[PDB]
Design a protein around this ligand. Structure first.
Ligand code: ADP
Ligand code: ADP
Ligand code: NA
Ligand code: NA
Lengths: 312, 312
């Protein structure tokens, strides 16, 4: 009954909005509310995929603390399988405090030593791999210790067991290059790069050229997210552009990529053709940019399906 | 077995240091650590009084959330009785985010709707008052709903059971004046105002003057904390100054007042005379200003007693 296993760091965000740009001008900021929220690509994806109707399991490692507890409770409420989401007293669950000014300005205070940086291949339980159909690596480069060699092993274990392999990416944190992951990429079935970051990573400027760098490493299908323009897909010699949902005015696109990937994976598991998977992903992502927060918009599934009847 | 009942708001803190004065512009601050800490006058006192060898119970109300559970974990660990520390599903446990600059500056982002603001007389269980000897109101004015009328009621209940009533203070949050709590003050045996804040509240400049406004309301003993100068004590005409522990460098005075009151209360329960109660309070407070954090310095009684020999 398990369709997806998502691997990545589960973390907690604490948004502080809105604060003055000259924060120390005053002594205190009595906000309307201060509360934790689950964040991180892995959490967002497992959460959205689950709401879309596909049973998911999250593999990660958090601390034995209040933030870790909040994550587990979130997963229990979303019906995310948490058997492989272990707690460790030796670490602190990463907590990202995001400050925002009553004008738009943003900044983030993070824990350079949080659980996000501690995640490694040891937190991956291969025995469970035969229980799901698809593996989603919620962000290559996100957790540095999960480098090329680790991913190659993770993906190698996934491929025995015949799983479909999906992966998103973020900008490298430790100067890594495409070189560092080219071998790991040869095992990937669907890669979901972000245009700007993919451009910076490959050093190429056009969608075709950027996509070719990944395909040359062995990736089967490349799905580049182009924000307002939807997405660009390339497999073998075939390319296809799929326009974003029309008319939408984005509040904020935080987590838009995660929602996109989730919608795509859902369509994939349901056997839709490549264009249909792209439209479902664009529709899911579109709904999420209309609300503040990564997982606010996509509350269920009906919402996405309704937007689909109105894609134009 | 139960020696003290402390009443106040139990909260959690997330200290962020060090951040830029010009916090925005950057996008990131990878700190060495971001972790929760229990905080609040009531929690700090219950904690230190417990480490000093006296059993304490904390009366409060927090949210039935992750933060709340964290406070309950801290209490159990410190052997603080949490029978009267209720969890409420409808409220969010207050979380204070503290920002500190590399060179001094401090600001706090708070939750104007937090549990701290919700505390009221209904959260006080008068039935247990017969189980303890001393009542400690961890800060008049801290929780607005506990105004002069409520305190009068609480203190009347405490006095009918012959408890010793101690009270600490903070600066009024909603423009309350000394007249708003003068009737309540007539039930207090020991009041611990901070010098600067007492000056603002009473409108006086002299310790003798300040102490006098409180004595006028019926307070038995006034113990004004004067930082590096130790403390000033005054009773019906009788006045006394007690020098602080000399030679104390002083790293930070966060929670120094809570430590002072805890040491004073411990000495009172041990039957010490007024002067040595002050010495013990000054000694406990001294140890706390040497370490960063409110309850970091005073880990055990022996640490204070050692410092006590050579108080000079
Ligand atoms: N303004 C928008 N209108 C419609 N869909 C959008 C919009 N912005 C983002 N999306 C959806 O989110 C997906 C991911 O967006 P992303 O590439 O990260 O955009 P950005 O760089 O603007 O943050 C897109 O492929 C699209 O489906
Ligand atoms: N520099 C110091 N040296 C010795 N004891 C100190 C010092 N600073 C504070 N204390 C202790 O803490 C108690 C309360 O401190 P308080 O007056 O509130 O300090 P502050 O004004 O720095 O907040 C004092 O009465 C004293 O016992
Ligand atoms: Na995005
Ligand atoms: Na103090």
């Amino acid at each position: 009954n398990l369709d997806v296993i998502c691997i990545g760091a589960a973390i907690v965000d604490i948004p502080l909005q809105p604060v003055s740009k000259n924060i120390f001008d005053v002594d205190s900021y009595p906000l309307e509310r201060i509360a934790m929220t689950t964040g991180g690509d892995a959490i967002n994806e497992a959460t959205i995929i689950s709401r879309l109707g596909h049973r998911t399991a999250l593999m990660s490692r958090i601390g034995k603390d209040a933030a870790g507890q909040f994550i587990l409770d979130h997963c229990r409420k979303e019906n995310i399988d948490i058997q492989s989401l272990k707690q460790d007293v030796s670490i602190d669950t990463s907590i990202n405090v995001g400050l925002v000014t009553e004008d738009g300005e943003r900044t983030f205070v993070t824990n350079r030593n949080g659980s996000l940086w501690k995640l490694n291949i040891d937190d991956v339980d291969f025995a469970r791999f035969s229980q799901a159909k698809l593996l989603s690596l919620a962000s290559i480069f996100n957790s540095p210790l999960l480098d090329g060699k680790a991913l190659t092993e993770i993906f190698t274990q996934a491929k025995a067991r015949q799983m479909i392999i999906c992966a998103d990416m973020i900008k490298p944190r430790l100067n890594e290059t495409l070189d560092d992951i080219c071998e790991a990429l040869s095992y990937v079935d669907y890669l979901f790069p972000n245009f700007a970051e993919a451009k910076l990573l490959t050093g190429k400027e056009t969608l075709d050229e950027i996509a070719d760098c990944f395909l040359a490493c062995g990736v089967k299908t490349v799905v580049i997210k182009t924000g307002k323009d939807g997405c660009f897909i390339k497999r073998g010699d075939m390319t296809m552009k799929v326009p974003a949902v029309a008319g939408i005015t984005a509040i904020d696109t935080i987590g838009a990529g995660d929602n996109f990937a989730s919608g795509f994976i859902a369509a994939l598991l349901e056997g839709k053709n490549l264009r249909e998977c792209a439209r479902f992903a664009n529709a899911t992502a579109a709904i999420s940019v209309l609300s503040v927060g990564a997982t606010t918009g996509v509350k269920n599934r009906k919402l996405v399906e309704q937007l689909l009847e109105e894609y134009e």
